[model samples]
Target: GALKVGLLLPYSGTYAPLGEAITRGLELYVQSQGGKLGGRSISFVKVDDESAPPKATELTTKLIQSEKADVLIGTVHSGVAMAMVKIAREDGIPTIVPNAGADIITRAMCAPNVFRTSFANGQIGRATGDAMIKAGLKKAVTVTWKYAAGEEMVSGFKKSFTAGKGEVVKDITIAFPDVEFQSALAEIASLKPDCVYAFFSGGGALKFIKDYAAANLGIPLWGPGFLTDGVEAAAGPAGDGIKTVLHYVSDLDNAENQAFVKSFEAAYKIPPDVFAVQGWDAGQLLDAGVKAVGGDVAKRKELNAAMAAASFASPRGPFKLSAAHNPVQNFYLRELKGGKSVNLGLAAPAVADEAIGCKL
Candidate 1:
């Protein structure tokens, strides 16, 4: 019997382009491996989540019940990932989340079947805090989207900043999903802090940055990786000079990453962004897990064991699964320079396996 893997993606909405990139990256890896894992041919079933939680839930149920997928992967939107977490929990199926950054997906859900290959919103926030401290910023203000992922990011930033002996003078949440941010900009400008930390994704982030620049806020704007990576199309010049923290950046200087960037750029005609790289890494991890289990999809315990012990050479260098089944990796500080993002060569606090409090 062949191992069947399912991909749930947002293929027909605001995040459609990202979903396509994820799918393309996943397929490229699977094909590069000759479509085989554990000495057996692999079969992939893909479904579109359409950027809606209910639609994601519906499509995931269909994949599980009708399609009988052995493993589940993908999702770019935090809301869709949150909904899928519930389904994966109820169904007792292993799910590898690649790009969704909502911390609550693991913190609140805490399902043994769910594993996240990407860093959580908290991790991003912590990375931002570390970068700010290293940059010698003492006081900061954060403006974040009023959503689960954004709030979690702000929470993590606050925690890490306070631990580093820095003060966050003001924390503001703009009504996201609707994205009227003029008032938020006004508030941020009034504070005049040393730096501004923001967490907004998609077009919302672009709008905020443009408006912030328009207001001539003297302080630098810092944030998580999402503000510039996937949303580059919307961000344009607004994203310029914005600093961010991420686990993986295209500019990482390593043999494996260099090869990945070259190959991906050749195939896609554009450099592989963080979202694409993470999805590709997740697929590679799944392939490794299947190989470790000798292609036995029925050997659920063995498969889980293999995944738990799995380590892979990723674009971020090397990453292993933490006890919480999330990635344990280095965080890098990056800044958008000359309309392109470049790594600032700063190392953030390593998110060790022990800190997440997962018992494996």
Candidate 2:
């Protein structure tokens, strides 16, 4: 039997490249297993989300209802993923999220049908806080896009940094997915804290980093993974010198990651970003789940059970799903140098257990 998996992605609009990268990563993983998982051939039906919330919800509904896809997956935008969560739950179709970082997606909307194989904002925040503490940063100023995803990242960073006994000098939020960031840059420059923690994705991150560097404040900038990754495709020189915390980087020294990096670069002619790695990881996780369930996509309950218990080797070293359907994995500190991201080292405050919030 063939299992039809619906790939709900942003195939058009500003996020098209990211969606394409994700699709490529997923395809690579599927091909790695000879296009079959647990003796079942995989059939992917791709849908375009367009990075719009309303469109994502509508498309996801169509995927489950009309397309009759056994599984639904993808989405880089938090709003898009959040919109699909309800549809997936209502229809009892399993979703494997690859790139949306909102903690609420797992914390509030988690169900047997929803599974996220990517790092949440809280996990990245914990990693950032650990990195800051290790760098001896005592005072910090934070800025983030005024959105749920950005707020979640900042909130998580604040919680983790405060828990680590660090003081927050200032926290600022700005309208995101918009054009103007000069005002936000001015505000950040005025603070002059030990370091600046920012949470912005896509074009916003590029503008923010460029403005920050142009300000010549000399403050060490730190941020969530997307700050470096989501903008890298178009950022080029603008992304230089920014530091961030992430679960995986192409520079990781491991056989699995090395192979992934080489293959991804060879295929795409570009380095694999966090989103791409996450997409690949999502496919691997789903493959493992299917194998665990003996290729039975029709048995939704059993499939969910298998997915809940499945663990696999990830580019981040090793990872497993928590109870809350979020990933439990190691975090790394990454720094951009000479147009390439370098993995500084593993971050502290590692939540190696699945009990805290990620329980299945």
Q: Which stretches of candidate 1 lie over 4 Å from their true place?
A: 104-108, 231-237, 353-360
lDDT of 1 by residue, 1-360 (tens): 767788898777656767877777777777767877667786778898876776877888888889999999968878788888878877877688988876766666756677888888777788788778878988989887676777878988998898899999999986546677788778877877899888776556667777877877778989887777766545667668888988877788888788888878778887777778887888878877788877777776677677878887887888787667778888888888666678887566456533343333
Measured by TM-score, the strongest candidate is 2
Candidate 2 residue runs with Cα over 4 Å from true position? 230-238, 349-360
Deviation of model 2 at 69, angstroms: 0.8
Error of 1 at 211 (Å): 3.3
Per-prediction count of colliding residue pairs? 0, 6
lDDT for residue 298 in candidate 2, whole number 0-100? 80
What's the lDDT for candidate 1?
A: 0.78
Instruction: Report how far off residue 243 is in candidate 1 (Å).
Output: 1.1
Question: Which candidate number would show the highest lDDT if scored against the true structure?
Answer: 2
lDDT of 2 by residue, 1-360 (tens): 578889988787656767887888888888778877677888889998887886876788889999999888977788888888867877787788988876767876778878887778776777787788878888898988677777778877888788888999888877656747678677767876889998876666777778777778878899977787856646667667788888877778878888888888787788888778888888887887787777878888878778877877776777787777778777878888766678888775346322344334
